[PDB]
Structures are given as C-alpha cells and as structure tokens.
Design a protein around this ligand. Structure first.
Ligand SMILES: [K+]
Ligand SMILES: [K+]
Ligand SMILES: [K+]
Ligand SMILES: [Mg+2]
Ligand SMILES: [Mg+2]
Ligand SMILES: [Mg+2]
Ligand SMILES: [Mg+2]
Ligand SMILES: [Mg+2]
Ligand SMILES: [Mg+2]
Ligand SMILES: [Mg+2]
Ligand SMILES: [Mg+2]
Ligand SMILES: [Mg+2]
Ligand SMILES: [Mg+2]
Ligand SMILES: [Mg+2]
Ligand SMILES: [Mg+2]
Ligand SMILES: [Mg+2]
Ligand SMILES: [Mg+2]
Ligand SMILES: [Mg+2]
Ligand SMILES: [Mg+2]
Ligand SMILES: [Mg+2]
Ligand SMILES: [Mg+2]
Ligand SMILES: [Mg+2]
Ligand SMILES: [Mg+2]
Ligand SMILES: [Mg+2]
Ligand SMILES: [Mg+2]
Ligand SMILES: [Mg+2]
Ligand SMILES: [Mg+2]
Ligand SMILES: [Mg+2]
Ligand SMILES: [Mg+2]
Ligand SMILES: [Mg+2]
Ligand SMILES: [Mg+2]
Ligand SMILES: [Mg+2]
Ligand SMILES: [Mg+2]
Ligand SMILES: [Mg+2]
Ligand SMILES: [Mg+2]
Ligand SMILES: [Mg+2]
Ligand SMILES: [Mg+2]
Ligand SMILES: [Mg+2]
Ligand SMILES: [Mg+2]
Ligand SMILES: [Mg+2]
Ligand SMILES: [Mg+2]
Ligand SMILES: [Mg+2]
Ligand SMILES: [Mg+2]
Ligand SMILES: [Mg+2]
Ligand SMILES: [Mg+2]
Ligand SMILES: [Mg+2]
Ligand SMILES: [Mg+2]
Ligand SMILES: [Mg+2]
Ligand SMILES: [Mg+2]
Ligand SMILES: [Mg+2]
Ligand SMILES: [Mg+2]
Ligand SMILES: [Mg+2]
Ligand SMILES: [Mg+2]
Ligand SMILES: [Mg+2]
Ligand SMILES: [Mg+2]
Ligand SMILES: [Mg+2]
Ligand SMILES: [Mg+2]
Ligand SMILES: [Mg+2]
Ligand SMILES: [Mg+2]
Ligand SMILES: [Mg+2]
Ligand SMILES: [Mg+2]
Ligand SMILES: [Mg+2]
Ligand SMILES: [Mg+2]
Ligand SMILES: [Mg+2]
Ligand SMILES: [Mg+2]
Ligand SMILES: [Mg+2]
Ligand SMILES: [Mg+2]
Ligand code: NA
Ligand code: NA
Ligand code: NA
Ligand code: NA
Ligand code: NA
Ligand SMILES: [Zn+2]
Lengths: 151, 81, 50
RNA sequence: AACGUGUCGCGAUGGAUGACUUGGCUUCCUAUUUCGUUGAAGAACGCAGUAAAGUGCGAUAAGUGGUAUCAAUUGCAGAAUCAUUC
RNA sequence: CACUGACAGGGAACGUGAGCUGGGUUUAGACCGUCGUGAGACAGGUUGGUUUUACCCUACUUAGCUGGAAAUUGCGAGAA
RNA sequence: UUAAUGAGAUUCCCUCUGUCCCGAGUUACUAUCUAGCGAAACGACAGUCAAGGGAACGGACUUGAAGGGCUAAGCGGGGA
RNA sequence: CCCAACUGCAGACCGUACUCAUCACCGCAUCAGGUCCCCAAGCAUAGAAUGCUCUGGUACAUAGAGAAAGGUACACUCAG
RNA sequence: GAUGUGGCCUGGAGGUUAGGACGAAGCUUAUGGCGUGAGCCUAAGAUGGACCGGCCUCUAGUGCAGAUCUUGGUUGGCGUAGCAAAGAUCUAACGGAGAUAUACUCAACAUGCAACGUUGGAUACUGGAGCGGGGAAGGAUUUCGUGCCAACGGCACUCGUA
RNA sequence: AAGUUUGAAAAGCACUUUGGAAAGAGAGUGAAAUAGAACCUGAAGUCGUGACAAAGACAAUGGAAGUACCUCCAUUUCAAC
C-alpha cells in the first residue's frame, strides 16, 4: 500500500494511481517538487507551469536537458515544462482534494506530506534499425502515491 | 541488387496445396508433392528423418476405422445370439 | 458530428468529386439524419446539398 | 548549498525458492492381441439452443440402437417424468 | 627555375587516417616480358579497384550554478 | 598499320572558373531550446600529470606537481 | 420424315466484396527499394522533354520556437 | 602435484530418535553465539501456511565468479542519439470529458497549456508516365454501417486498413 | 514459450463519494485481500520514499589498530555482594 502512514489518520487524505502511462522520469520531477507544499500553492504551481511562467526543476533525471532562467527559483539551472505529467498530477491532486472534502476536512489547510513515484511495469514496442536489426522501444509508466495532512 | 530489392522480384508460386496431405508442398510445374510424393501411390518415408515419420504416422490423425476394428478384435467379434 | 457518409453519397449521386459537393454549414443535424441515397437525394432537392 | 555516497524502516519492479504434481522417464507382466478394394492410415469440410480452439461425432453429425446402472447434466437455458422401463 | 635577411638540421608511436586525402604499396578482374609441361610465379612493368562508429571518461575550448580557512566539523580564538 | 567508334590509360593548348592566393556574405534543412515519443553500441573497476623503474610506452605502483563540488555546448590528444 | 416463318417451354456449374500499393503484395514493418496491362486533358514547345493549369485526388507522411559553432543540399554570389 | 581428516555441505534409501496449527519448509537480518575454517546453532519477523530435524549406515544428475558459457530478468549509457527526402497549412463554427478547469488577494494579461474529428471559407500540392479511374500476380474480409479508444497506427486522434 | 498454484467455500469487493473513463478514497466478504482473478510462497539484482551518518578534490573497495556516536544483540552484576 502506502510506504508511509500519516501522523493523524483522521486528518489526512490519500490518493493513488497505478500504471499512469506518463514518463516515470518526468513524473518523478513533477511530483517531487510539491512534496512539502500546501495543496493550494501546489495547484497554483502546476497552473503556472502550464502557462510556462514557472518550471519543474529536474534534479535527478536531467542528463543533457536544456538550461533555463526559471530553474533559479529552485536553486538549479536545468528545468522543463512536462505538460503531460502536470495534467496527470493535477488530476491526482483533485482526487486527493475530493477525499479530504468527503472526510470533512478543509482543502485550504491541506499540506502534502508524502510523494512517491515508482517505476511501473514497462510496455514493449519495437523499432527498426539499419541492417535488418530489431531493437526495443520500451514505454516506462509510473506509480504515484501521495497523502496530505491538515496543518 | 541481391537482397532487399530482389525480394520484390519474387512473383507467383512454386507450391500450392496438395490434395493428399494439404501441406502446400505440391510443385505446380512438376505436378508432384514435395511432402508426400503425390501422385505416386506410396508416400515419402525416410529414416534420416524419424521426426518427420512420427509427424505423419498412424495415430497422429483420427483413426476413424482403426478404433472400431480394434474394439471388434478385442471383443473377439461378438455377435448377438 | 461527422458528415463523411453523406458527403460520400452526395458525391456519387451528383456524379462529381468531393471538391464540387457543397454541404450546408448550417442545418447539419438534418444532413446527418440522411443515412440512405433516398434521404440524401431529398437534401439535394431541398438545397442543403449543392 | 545542489548533485552524489552510505545505513536502516517501508514500498515498487522483478518471478527465483519451498511446498504441491491427473506429467515424464525407466523396468516388469498378462492375451481367442495386429489395418486396408467389405475402401485403410493420412488429409479436408461440417455437426451443439448457446460453441473460436480442443474433444467427440458424420446430414441419424458433442450423437442413433442394445445391455447394464439408478437421478442427473450444469456457465446459462431448456427438458414428459420424478421416474420398472418406454 | 625564382624570390629572399635566410631559404638550418631534427624529435614528438619513422607526431598527426573515429582529422582529411588515397597517388603508391598489398586481395579478387585484365595485359606484357621472363620463368614454369602445367596449375601458376615474379623487392619486374601496366590499368581498374567500398577508407565505418563518439551521445561515454578524461584532455582542451568556451558557457552557467555553487558552497567553503578544523578546506563542509570544534565552541580549535593567530588581523601585513 | 589503321579511318570511324570509346563513361578505357596519358600529355599539351584555348576557353573557363572559389581548385588555389585567401577567404567573405546569404538561403533551406539540421545541430541548438521546448512538447510528445524514445533507442543502440559499449560497459572488469575506474578515469589530472612529470619522471622513475616495470612484460623495455601507467589511470592505479615510487617520488614529486596538481586537484572545491555539480553542470550546457562542442571537440577529436589519449583511453596502445 | 425433311425445310420456312413463327410460337410455347427451358437455358445447368464455379468466380464476382476490396486491394493492386510513398499503407492492402515481397523486403521481420503502414520500409524513399522492387512489382505486368488499359484509358491519359489545356497552354508554352519539336515534344509523353520541362514548367504551370480545368477535371479527379490530396494537405498523409511528429510538431512549435528560432540568425551559435560545425555540417548536409535535387542552393547561390564574390574584387584582382 | 600426492595423501589424510568420529572434516563441512546437498537430493534420495535402510535404521534409530525427535519436532510441527501454542505454526513445518522456504525467505528476510547492525540476531548474537560457536568453530582456524567449510559451516552449525539460537533470536526476531509488525514473514509464511504444512511438513520436517539430529545421529549410524547406504546411495548419487551432490557444492560455482568468470568457459566471447546457457536461459530468464535487470541495468548505466538516457529522457540521451534521434523521430530533418516526397514544399503547407490558416480561419470560424459545430462536436467532444478533453475547459474560459484558481485558497486568499484579485477587472481582464501576467495562474488549464498543448492537442483532436466534421462542415463552410482561404491557401497550396499532385499536374493525365497523377497521392486519377479499372485489372493480372499476391493478399483474403482489409469492403460496408453502427459502436468504441485497453493495446496498435514509433507524435497525436474524438480518427482508423485497430 | 506457457503449472489458471486465489480461497475451505466465490463468500470474486453490494453500496457511498471523486473521476469522461481507467481508477482513487471509504465501506463490505473472508481466519487471512500485503489471498482481489494469470491472485500460494514472493528471493536476488535494480529503483522510490522517510529517517539518519556524514563526506572536499586522494576512483572506490580493502588491512591493522584506536576513537566518536548508535545498538529492537548477547552475557554478567546489583551488598560489606
Ligand atoms: K605485377
Ligand atoms: K580437527
Ligand atoms: K541473458
Ligand atoms: Mg544534444
Ligand atoms: Mg541539452
Ligand atoms: Mg529505423
Ligand atoms: Mg530489411
Ligand atoms: Mg524474375
Ligand atoms: Mg528488372
Ligand atoms: Mg518454375
Ligand atoms: Mg504445368
Ligand atoms: Mg470411404
Ligand atoms: Mg607515423
Ligand atoms: Mg625516432
Ligand atoms: Mg580513417
Ligand atoms: Mg595517412
Ligand atoms: Mg588518430
Ligand atoms: Mg590507390
Ligand atoms: Mg612456356
Ligand atoms: Mg594495381
Ligand atoms: Mg593488378
Ligand atoms: Mg573504374
Ligand atoms: Mg568550519
Ligand atoms: Mg604519465
Ligand atoms: Mg579520442
Ligand atoms: Mg565529432
Ligand atoms: Mg461484382
Ligand atoms: Mg468490383
Ligand atoms: Mg493499378
Ligand atoms: Mg507484406
Ligand atoms: Mg517472410
Ligand atoms: Mg514527363
Ligand atoms: Mg508535357
Ligand atoms: Mg486540382
Ligand atoms: Mg507514408
Ligand atoms: Mg504534412
Ligand atoms: Mg519520417
Ligand atoms: Mg548553420
Ligand atoms: Mg537426484
Ligand atoms: Mg529421521
Ligand atoms: Mg533489520
Ligand atoms: Mg545490511
Ligand atoms: Mg545437517
Ligand atoms: Mg553436476
Ligand atoms: Mg549462481
Ligand atoms: Mg562473457
Ligand atoms: Mg534508465
Ligand atoms: Mg534531443
Ligand atoms: Mg536523421
Ligand atoms: Mg517532408
Ligand atoms: Mg477546415
Ligand atoms: Mg487565465
Ligand atoms: Mg485551452
Ligand atoms: Mg503545381
Ligand atoms: Mg512541381
Ligand atoms: Mg497531358
Ligand atoms: Mg495513377
Ligand atoms: Mg473502411
Ligand atoms: Mg503513437
Ligand atoms: Mg471480519
Ligand atoms: Mg503476506
Ligand atoms: Mg497469502
Ligand atoms: Mg503472491
Ligand atoms: Mg528485491
Ligand atoms: Mg532504501
Ligand atoms: Mg585509493
Ligand atoms: Mg570503527
Ligand atoms: Na569505355
Ligand atoms: Na590503461
Ligand atoms: Na602517485
Ligand atoms: Na513502398
Ligand atoms: Na525534429
Ligand atoms: Zn502431398
């Protein structure tokens, strides 16, 4: 299940998604940046990433990606705007907000306390190379789990 | 040249389905089957391929009559009084 | 709403190519109700296909 | 600082291990035990209320008849009888 | 041959082919001479003959972020 | 020996030119940045040098000289 | 029984969808390769060259932003 | 290189002696103890769910780090190389969950982006040796309508030879 | 290539809520869903996360001795013992 449990179970809301069909590496950076944020400010950041006024910092899987000035706010130099991962993470936050509202909590006081992106089972395709070679064309989905606690 | 381009030069068929075995080994031009030697009376059978013999021998099909006659033999051709 | 079927039938009935077939941009929900050559022929007579 | 490193707790991916075994392999025995022009073996089509494969069967087609046996078959449905039998 | 003050000699895996080029050398085709019965041979001549891969680590060239004097710690205290 | 013929081998002349002196400017598509997608080769471990010895040409060993960490674009000296 | 013009009745079997290719076939694939036949418009022009156009067909082949170096081109120019 | 070891370990057999639903085998370990060692044993499982230990003897397909070893899986390279021949798309409306998607503040921009199908306009290409209309070979339902979008059409799809 | 080896029994997750859906959050069945349908056990390798340890550049690993801090470990001792 969830790799961690909330401090107060009755004051928390949890959301999950398995086999997302979003790039695990992109979703790893998109979801990790909101790990300690209030829910409302995490949702604002995703809206501004879609507007391309702020970026998602790429801290681990950033091998030879481009440099941008919008990564300075995160203390980095390299960042990106992974729109596919942002909309999926936006949907997950909406589910978590719905779980909190159904439990009688206030989403405006909800703080994300746990984010975990894990590599899911891969899907196999093939690509055709020179000299009659056939080579893998793997797809890498992800599992995303999170919960938020009342502040 | 030989290879990919010449693969598109291959037209027609050397073999079609055989009436006796249905294996797509009937040489259209030579009018004989590469798998069972039809229309020769006897079939193809070679000891250098025992594996091929076991694929086509008795018992690999239905044995519609052999099942009946084996029961009759095992019961000594029982008949009503 | 897709009018691919009606355009195909109208092109055959009128004996012309797709570029010469005009489907009324308005009144699209009654064009999509024509699933037969009989009904497309009524649209042509009514002036919804030209 | 940030990447990165190490340890521990918890997760994921991944299907080894153990237990299980209606399979295989090997040995031995018993017979009014050895196919076909009276059309075999093999090959092809088809057949169920529902049925792709497989199995069984051949336009009498998942079977007819006869002996036993005694209430089912079964995913659903259908089915005279609740059965000496028909 | 000519200019110049001068047209010194050398090394760097006979510097340097994932830098180039491919004229030579040294495959298979072919011609000549000589040799060999022959197939063939010749540091003899001749003509024709695919030059592959960097996105890794260093090196180098530029280009960003960034802590740190107990060179991350000690509170371990030294001023050109 | 030979007219004609030849994507055959060779030499010279006219013309012509960025082949060169000696390089410069411009275009399309790239590279480059982004969204989506997404491999391979290769991979003992790794990766700053000088000299020394050493299997006689070291990234590891000896003695010295360097070396704060992480990064983007290139590049072909080394990685025999 | 045989001719002429009628008339009456009967004319059995199999194939028939679709494709024929910058996506329907072969090349491991919707692969810039390969694959026989028929119909073939207007103008320029010698014209089945080449260029453009009515009919028919198509906007499908990852896109956006956008003057680094270095590239590739069925892209150019350059004083003496 | 030879030999020795009441020397260690594994699958089975003949004996013997034990254990297990109050938890067997297997598995996990900053669980310690013992042995020079091969290894043995205990502890814990917030592991498991049914078999199995010791000792004597017998037996064998009996011990792995490497064989450009075999099979399966994984992996750095790496969100990297790239996805650049065949000139090309623009616009409004309709459809669609695919939007004009927002704690406070806040008139709108500076906080839901990017992408689809159809129709009408626009622009362009093919240019009759055609991304035209029919056939053979080959293929065999790809044809047609409706529905549908998990996988597939190396981007995308509400579209499709799925 | 592939054991359909879930569970004793399908009792195979009604119903509520968010979502277009896939699914999530609850609630139920069951001794056990970390037994939820290619479902017993679930290793290694690799990866994520939280906590902690720190750490220049001596590639890392290693040996021997100490020390600092930790220790769900073991053993001993706790009255003139
Ligand atoms: K020679
Ligand atoms: K001893
Ligand atoms: K392997
Ligand atoms: Mg690059
Ligand atoms: Mg980059
Ligand atoms: Mg390719
Ligand atoms: Mg090929
Ligand atoms: Mg031929
Ligand atoms: Mg030819
Ligand atoms: Mg022939
Ligand atoms: Mg013939
Ligand atoms: Mg017969
Ligand atoms: Mg040299
Ligand atoms: Mg020398
Ligand atoms: Mg070279
Ligand atoms: Mg050279
Ligand atoms: Mg070189
Ligand atoms: Mg040469
Ligand atoms: Mg001679
Ligand atoms: Mg030569
Ligand atoms: Mg030669
Ligand atoms: Mg030549
Ligand atoms: Mg300090
Ligand atoms: Mg050196
Ligand atoms: Mg190099
Ligand atoms: Mg290069
Ligand atoms: Mg027809
Ligand atoms: Mg037809
Ligand atoms: Mg044609
Ligand atoms: Mg094909
Ligand atoms: Mg083939
Ligand atoms: Mg022409
Ligand atoms: Mg012409
Ligand atoms: Mg036109
Ligand atoms: Mg195409
Ligand atoms: Mg296009
Ligand atoms: Mg392409
Ligand atoms: Mg350029
Ligand atoms: Mg054995
Ligand atoms: Mg015992
Ligand atoms: Mg532990
Ligand atoms: Mg450990
Ligand atoms: Mg033992
Ligand atoms: Mg062995
Ligand atoms: Mg092993
Ligand atoms: Mg090997
Ligand atoms: Mg990876
Ligand atoms: Mg790239
Ligand atoms: Mg390319
Ligand atoms: Mg193109
Ligand atoms: Mg339009
Ligand atoms: Mg707005
Ligand atoms: Mg929008
Ligand atoms: Mg044109
Ligand atoms: Mg043209
Ligand atoms: Mg013409
Ligand atoms: Mg044509
Ligand atoms: Mg169709
Ligand atoms: Mg796609
Ligand atoms: Mg209960
Ligand atoms: Mg469990
Ligand atoms: Mg279980
Ligand atoms: Mg399991
Ligand atoms: Mg593991
Ligand atoms: Mg961990
Ligand atoms: Mg060292
Ligand atoms: Mg120590
Ligand atoms: Na010639
Ligand atoms: Na070396
Ligand atoms: Na040294
Ligand atoms: Na083609
Ligand atoms: Na591109
Ligand atoms: Zn045959």
């Amino acid at each position: 299940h969830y790799s961690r449990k909330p401090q107060v179970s009755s004051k928390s809301a949890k959301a999950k998604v398995s086999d997302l069909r979003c790039h695990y590496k992109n979703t790893f950076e998109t979801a990790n940046v909101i790990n300690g944020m209030p829910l409302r400010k995490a949702q604002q950041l995703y809206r501004q990433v879609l507007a391309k006024t702020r970026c998602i910092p790429f801290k681990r899987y950033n091998g030879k990606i481009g440099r941008t000035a919008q990564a300075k706010e995160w203390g980095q130099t390299k960042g990106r705007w992974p729109r596919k991962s942002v909309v999926a993470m936006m949907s997950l936050l909406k589910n978590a907000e719905a779980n909190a509202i159904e439990k009688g909590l206030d989403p405006n006081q909800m703080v994300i306390k746990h984010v975990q992106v894990d590599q899911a089972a891969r899907m196999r395709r093939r690509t055709y190379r020179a000299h009659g070679r056939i080579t893998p064309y793997m797809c890498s989905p992800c599992h995303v789990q999170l919960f938020m606690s009342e502040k | 040249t030989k290879g990919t381009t010449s693969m598109g030069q291959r037209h027609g068929r050397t073999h079609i389905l055989c009436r006796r075995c249905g294996r797509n080994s009937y040489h259209v031009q030579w009018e004989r089957c590469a798998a069972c030697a039809y229309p020769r009376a006897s079939r193809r059978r070679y000891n250098w391929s025992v594996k091929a013999i076991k694929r086509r021998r008795t018992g690999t099909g239905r044995c519609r009559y052999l099942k009946v006659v084996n029961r009759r033999i095992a019961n000594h051709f029982k008949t009503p009084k | 709403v897709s009018l691919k079927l009606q355009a195909r039938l109208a092109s055959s009935i009128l004996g012309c190519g797709r570029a010469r077939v005009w489907l009324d941009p308005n009144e699209a929900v009654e064009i999509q109700n024509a699933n037969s050559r009989k009904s497309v022929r009524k649209l042509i007579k009514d002036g919804f296909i030209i």
